Design a binder for this molecule. Structure first.
Ligand SMILES: C=CCCn1cc(-c2cc(C(=O)N3CCOCC3)cc3c2ncn3C)c2cc[nH]c2c1=O
Length: 135
């Protein structure tokens, strides 16, 4: 449990201190309200925003950077689909993605260790669950 909690706390700090700090990133902070953007959900089948990512982190959805990056990269993919690649929204989404990748890279050593520990704790719990299943 301790490694997963630490990993989640680190991901949350990247979201609030780096990604939400990107200038003009406010349109990405919360889910789109269709009352302001009427056809958003007709175009975007897999919506994503920074609040949803923080909610996912609170629930410990991410065990590795790969699953975290899958949701982060959706923010950029959704913007290119809805706004076009040339849009100022897309430029902001790219800057949110950039600061995320750059921050994760600066934490590479410690995040690799936490990911290995999360995986080790998971595998050990599953082996124990299988052995005790006949009790
Ligand atoms: C999360 C990813 C979506 C990014 N995004 C956002 C908006 C956008 C969303 C909202 C909105 O619904 N809000 C505000 C934030 O709090 C919740 C309610 C309001 C907006 C907006 N643009 C101008 N206003 C006044 C927009 C418009 C055209 N393309 C986009 C676009 O790609």
């Amino acid at each position: 449990d301790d490694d997963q909690v630490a990993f989640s706390f680190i991901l949350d700090n990247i979201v609030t201190q780096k990604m939400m700090a990107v200038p003009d990133s406010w349109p990405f902070h919360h889910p789109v309200n269709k009352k302001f953007v009427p056809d958003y959900y007709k175009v975007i089948v897999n919506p994503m925003d920074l609040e949803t990512i923080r909610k996912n982190i609170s629930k410990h959805k991410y065990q590795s950077r790969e699953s975290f990056l899958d949701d982060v990269n959706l923010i950029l993919a959704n913007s290119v689909k809805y706004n076009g690649p040339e849009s100022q929204y897309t430029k902001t989404a790219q800057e949110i993605v950039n600061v995320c990748y750059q921050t994760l890279t600066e934490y590479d050593e410690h995040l690799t260790q936490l990911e290995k520990d999360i995986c080790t704790a998971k595998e050990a719990a599953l082996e124990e669950a299988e052995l005790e299943s006949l009790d």
